[PDB]
Design a protein around this ligand. Sequence first.
Ligand SMILES: Nc1ncnc2c1ncn2[C@@H]1O[C@H](COP(=O)(O)OP(=O)(O)OP(O)(O)=S)[C@@H](O)[C@H]1O
Ligand SMILES: Nc1ncnc2c1ncn2[C@@H]1O[C@H](COP(=O)(O)OP(=O)(O)OP(O)(O)=S)[C@@H](O)[C@H]1O
Ligand SMILES: [Mg+2]
Ligand SMILES: [Mg+2]
Lengths: 865, 852, 15
Amino acid sequence: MQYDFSLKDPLFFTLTDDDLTDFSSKYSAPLPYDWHELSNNSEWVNQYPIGFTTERQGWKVHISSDYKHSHEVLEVVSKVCHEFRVVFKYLKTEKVFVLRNGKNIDRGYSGKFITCYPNIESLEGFLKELERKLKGYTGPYILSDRRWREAPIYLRYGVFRESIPELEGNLKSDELLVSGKIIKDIRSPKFIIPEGLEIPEFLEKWLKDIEFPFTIESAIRFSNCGGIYNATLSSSNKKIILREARPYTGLDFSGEYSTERMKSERRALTILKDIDGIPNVFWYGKLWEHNFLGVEKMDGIPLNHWLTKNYPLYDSKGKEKYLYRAKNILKQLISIVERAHKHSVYHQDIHFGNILIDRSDRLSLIDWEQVRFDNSKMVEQKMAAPGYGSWIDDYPSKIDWYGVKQIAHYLYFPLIEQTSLVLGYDQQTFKVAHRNFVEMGYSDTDIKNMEVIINALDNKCSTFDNLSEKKILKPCLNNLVINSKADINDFASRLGKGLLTISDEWKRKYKNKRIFPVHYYGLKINQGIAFSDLGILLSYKKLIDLLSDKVDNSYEEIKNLAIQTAIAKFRDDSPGLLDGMSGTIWIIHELGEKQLAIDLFRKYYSEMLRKSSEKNIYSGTAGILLVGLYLISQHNDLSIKELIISDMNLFADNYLFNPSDFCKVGVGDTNSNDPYEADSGLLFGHTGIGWLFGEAYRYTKNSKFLKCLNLAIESELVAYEKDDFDRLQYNQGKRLLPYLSTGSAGLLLLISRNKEFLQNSVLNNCHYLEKAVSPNFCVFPGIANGMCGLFLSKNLYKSNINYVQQCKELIRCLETYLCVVEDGFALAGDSGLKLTTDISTGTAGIILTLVSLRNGKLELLPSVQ
Amino acid sequence: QYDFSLKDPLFFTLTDDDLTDFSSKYSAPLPYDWHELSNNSEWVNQYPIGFTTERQGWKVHISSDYKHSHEVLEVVSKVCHEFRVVFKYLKTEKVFVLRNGKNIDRGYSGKFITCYPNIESLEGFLKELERKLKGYTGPYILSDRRWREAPIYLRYGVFRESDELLVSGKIIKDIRSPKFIIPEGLEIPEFLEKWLKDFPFTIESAIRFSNCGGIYNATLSSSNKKIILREARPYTGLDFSGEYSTERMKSERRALTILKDIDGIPNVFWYGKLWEHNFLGVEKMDGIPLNHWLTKNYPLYDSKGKEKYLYRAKNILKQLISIVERAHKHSVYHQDIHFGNILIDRSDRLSLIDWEQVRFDNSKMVEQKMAAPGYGSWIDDYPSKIDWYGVKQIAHYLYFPLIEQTSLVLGYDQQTFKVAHRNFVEMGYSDTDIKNMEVIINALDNKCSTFDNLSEKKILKPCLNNLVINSKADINDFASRLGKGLLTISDEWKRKYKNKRIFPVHYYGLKINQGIAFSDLGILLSYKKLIDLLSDKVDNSYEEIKNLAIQTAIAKFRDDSPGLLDGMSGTIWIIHELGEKQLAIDLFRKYYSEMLRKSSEKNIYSGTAGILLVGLYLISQHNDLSIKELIISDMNLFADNYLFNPSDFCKVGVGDTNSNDPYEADSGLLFGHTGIGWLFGEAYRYTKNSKFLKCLNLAIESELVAYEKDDFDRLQYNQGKRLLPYLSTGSAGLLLLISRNKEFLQNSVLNNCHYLEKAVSPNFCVFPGIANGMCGLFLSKNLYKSNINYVQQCKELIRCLETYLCVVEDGFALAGDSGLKLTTDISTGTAGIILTLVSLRNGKLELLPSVQ
Amino acid sequence: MLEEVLKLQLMDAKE
Ligand SMILES: Nc1ncnc2c1ncn2[C@@H]1O[C@H](COP(=O)(O)OP(=O)(O)OP(O)(O)=S)[C@@H](O)[C@H]1O
Ligand SMILES: Nc1ncnc2c1ncn2[C@@H]1O[C@H](COP(=O)(O)OP(=O)(O)OP(O)(O)=S)[C@@H](O)[C@H]1O
Ligand SMILES: [Mg+2]
Ligand SMILES: [Mg+2]
């Protein structure tokens, strides 16, 4: 799907639709007596005459402007529009103007300050009067449009309004009507004229009035400032990197454009003319109206890619000289931006994307767009990568050293995104990285030489007093000693206290909303066991029933209103287990509402199985079948039981009949972490089918279900491949994922669970998948895409398992990703940026990990004994 | 109380629903073993994780000025982190400004950090606080006492969980009063016992008290001259520009010694500092303010006895112009010139007071700080232009005293300028007086500044042209504009406050979402009756809005509101009138027996008489239901109790309060015996028992006890200070009571209606609402008279409503019973106009249930 | 070269 989360809250993820704090200056125009001004958006303000509407399509007029002359161009354009009575609209505030004329907005939606709608007849005089009165006013070229004559007046053929037009005109707001046909309106950085529409005569004259000193081969990245092109200079046949800045774009809140912090970049790269590891400006000049910068193409993959090839994720075998090379890379960075600070040049944006490493370990520092030149002041870092920007308003000389300190901690333990949330997290992971680097077998002199440089970079930064809203989060400096079940119960009670503390503070800040902060992959959902509040309430209940406490006073009312909200929002455009209503009804069954659960399940079973699209356990019919199997195994009085077993038999016959028609049987190409763009593992693939038909075999014994189990194993190990030593991991096209949702940790759970029924030839893979799921460093802490599923696969259904000895490893691994709030624990999900309480990424997955370790059976999926 | 905010530019909103918060934060460093929890919207608490405080003890209150508030916090927090004491502090800089402001109670004044120490560590805590807050200055907190000299102040109160101060087994309860109260029976420590043991002018009274100090009426001993006195406590009286009352008093002294020779401007008699309080002793002159002089002298009803109003008003306006011109000659600018800053004596000599906001520089555009609502400038203007805007609005106030809506609609003063001219040529004034006043007002209009309306209230335009009403299509067009502007106002309210009330209303009913008077279902009922009036169809989503509002009203019942204008009894009646009946009988038979019994009030607005009205309506429209006898028996016992004692239900006599609050009102239709007589008249129309007629005749006299005559035979209800002719609290409800029960009452009762009809027909009405306003007067004078015409009555109604009407989009809106912001309710709003039109069309009054 | 210049935006490996 599409997510519009914002990093505006200091502690939590929040959508931009819930962002309303606008202290910027409001744009306004005078309103005549026979005019009305109406807003029905968060960006635009519509002005229309009384009782006059426009057409549904036609030539719309776009007007762009500067930031300084934007309030006084609105007066001129509104004064023009108040004789030529046309419907025009403009941007709300100055912040909307900056975010529309910024950098990371789409090139087809950018630059539009004022949009006008003359019908067909006032357009000719309207364009002439706007051309006559907009002298001296300049603005960005809008890429989807075409400039009229010389003033910032821009035209396209587009859709004016939504329907109107007698009854409903049988048309939509995305498709135009040319000669009684359906042509879609493409909103792209291009001028699209649909073929066949009658151009007027003056517009026909306007449309009929339509060598570089380099050779551009391709493009690397595109933005509202303009592209970054991989070009080759014609005068030398030498490959460079191009970067353009179309005028009056890249607006920030300082008031600068991309044409100003490009003369700044040219001056910065001219001052640092001869430094090893620094790009050189080779060509700078304006072509038409776009100025171009030719910098030296520094070779090398970025720092995260070099780390992914070179960090000891699993063992020290082969990567036996990592710390010496990382020390050399860090010293190369320190030398480069300390020779840069002698020339009064400050980079102000140092993160893992701005360092490139060669195959011979040579460092290059790029992206000098945000350079400062005069120290002298406590300045604000404008646009910084999260985890690397400075916390306070400091000098330009210390912002680069903070960036170098975070690169130093990145090279020594790759968890940096939580240092922007918890102050002192770089010392929390310092001891963990020391323990990991003495556990692998590294030399003590290499660790000492790394740690001396890191500790010397720690003293080169600024020590401040935390005054922000995220100073309630403290690191875990003291490691807990786990020796008995009381020490495990203390940790579990601290998890339960921190969960309710963070929930109460979220409900304090955001009323009339969700009762729990959730990772941005599931912000605008409240169903299914990955991101819902009901799953967190279930995890809290099974945590209370683990250490035998009582409910936290208002917990019964919280779970009553959560269940009532789930009933009120019980849709049907889903049927999923971990994103929909089968997981919601299994939560309702597990919370203590079993009669209401079987009632509502038998109420919507037929429609909620018939209306479905996918086939996985996540968002396909397998989740419905597994909830029905749990309901008829726990309760043998279901009147809909025969329809459940017949649908399982039909699904089994379809699984034997159709090959590779359930999901993708292959490698794949998607390299993202979105759950809807993954098609493998326990949650998204044939392993969910095997989990369904290894429990259907347990309850309703058939040869067809064991045949489905072996077919699921034989289909799943096609994509699983042997690594360098002994590891079997799934390929997502460009990377390998041993996680519980997409890889080796989900398959081994049912090979170990169904080990008695299954044969020997694919219990032989239990050792090949065992050390492929035991690394030394795991990036995320969650149960699905992280360490708590890696631990659960390694330990659960493995026989002769001690609770205390397993928890002693678990808590020791869990004190890497933890933070302290009140007298409890909180944790950040699969970003590290903001606090999460959900199951698939946040604290409730750890709570369910402890519950599933105590009980011996999973709580993420039904595991009927 | 009503904690309403004038922050939204269009509608009344609540201060609890305020979340702008520019408001630079106050922050203190948090150690590892401490937490910071902010439960309130103004306080931020810090505690050392799991360590509590005693329930009673000695607080420590620490004050600070505006400049050093960010540094006192960093010292007090560092002390409290050593001596581990639960302390709390203010959230933002804005709430510091409001807590150290001017119009705040002196029980909540100056408190910046409220520490909660223990008894054992209190001596060391106070020693470290005195050692490290030495040199810092702050306001004095009147409820506490200063420790030695530093801004540490001490109070014995309640630390946490309500206000009970139980000591030695007796409830004492702490009071947030501006005095130092030591409660009886405390184990006082030794150092706190040693600490507790270590006028040229005569004060006659004190007019006003505030956070700046007080305004006193005094007398010099040396000169024996009656003066007025001002106080400025140090570092108290902060505004958003960072100045205190001690500087405003110095500016007032500078201004009043610059303007020493000008008459009407007070002279400085005594300026001295006693203790630490600055005192200014300028001259008190005789006279009443401009509001009381205008209420005494404006021709509210006729011109008899006030024939020379436009001559004296012209002379007084010339005096104000001369005073402002002579003040502006010496570069002295008043910056707050409204009806409360001008005194006029019995000889009609003007005096201009309250020079606290005075300025001395005209070279820069400034912003008016404490602007009166309706007199403040819309833009950042020059100070001379700000004073001339104030004088122009005072001129318009003397010409037509509707001045509050000029802060909402740009051009309302020239809208009411034609209304005032028509009223003055209709009353029989001379042409020369009108021209001589109008040339002065038009001269003051040109001395102000013109500007473009770029605010959010640019969508409200004045009703410049009078609608020509000749036929019923004109009334239908007017009503279509009313219902079309109502939906526009509703949708634009919905845009800026989602998951809240559907319609915007008065500040008297921001919390009320039930009944006719202040709910959303009533305005939906008004829209439905308007659609039925025009014979049109509802636009797009009226059914969905009505269903969602009905289900929300079902989910928000509470049994503490048993009245039809604020509770369940009106929601049931509206739900019956919205289209579904059997649902309303189901709710009535479910809730009647509990809401008639759980009832403390017994009026119409909140009491059991409204329950009996909405039961009588339900048993009249539906003759077959099980609870029919239970309503008849309840009204029979209710009428027997009325025959037993008429004074036991409401107040029979002159009132005491002088406020527009519905809960502070105790007479009239919705609040007194007139609605009791209304219920009993409908009970006589249904039951036809003579006991109801006897009770109605008793209610007529019980209301008419508190009605006095005047020199012009106008029968108005006496509230004690003002005379009320309105519908809710006055004589218009009585006029509808005799007019509706016309064929039942005796001719001695009908002799009073001729004198009642002169009271309901003035020339000028302050408010446009249906309850406390002009629409109720029009309904009382034009319902149930003899024949009831429609075109002529609607022509006069539209002509009188054009004084108050706004224009939004393609329709009309209404500013309420303050005039400040837009309302849509059936008491102060557009739906009142809507049901005024529908009740003029359909005969019967549609504010209360009735039978046929 | 208005056109050419603007064509550059319509290259590949975009945003
Ligand atoms: N001098 C250079 N040498 C080699 N590669 C470069 C150079 N400059 C840019 N690049 C490449 O361009 C990619 C992005 O760099 P820039 O476009 O300079 O920064 P940017 O992407 O504009 O900053 P963002 O992410 O848009 S806010 C990098 O991944 C590099 O591969
Ligand atoms: N110089 C004066 N002569 C006579 N009466 C005065 C004088 N100053 C104030 N008053 C009386 O006090 C009232 C005006 O109160 P103010 O002193 O102006 O209140 P303030 O505190 O200055 O401002 P407000 O009313 O609180 S916003 C009037 O009723 C006056 O009669
Ligand atoms: Mg970059
Ligand atoms: Mg005053």
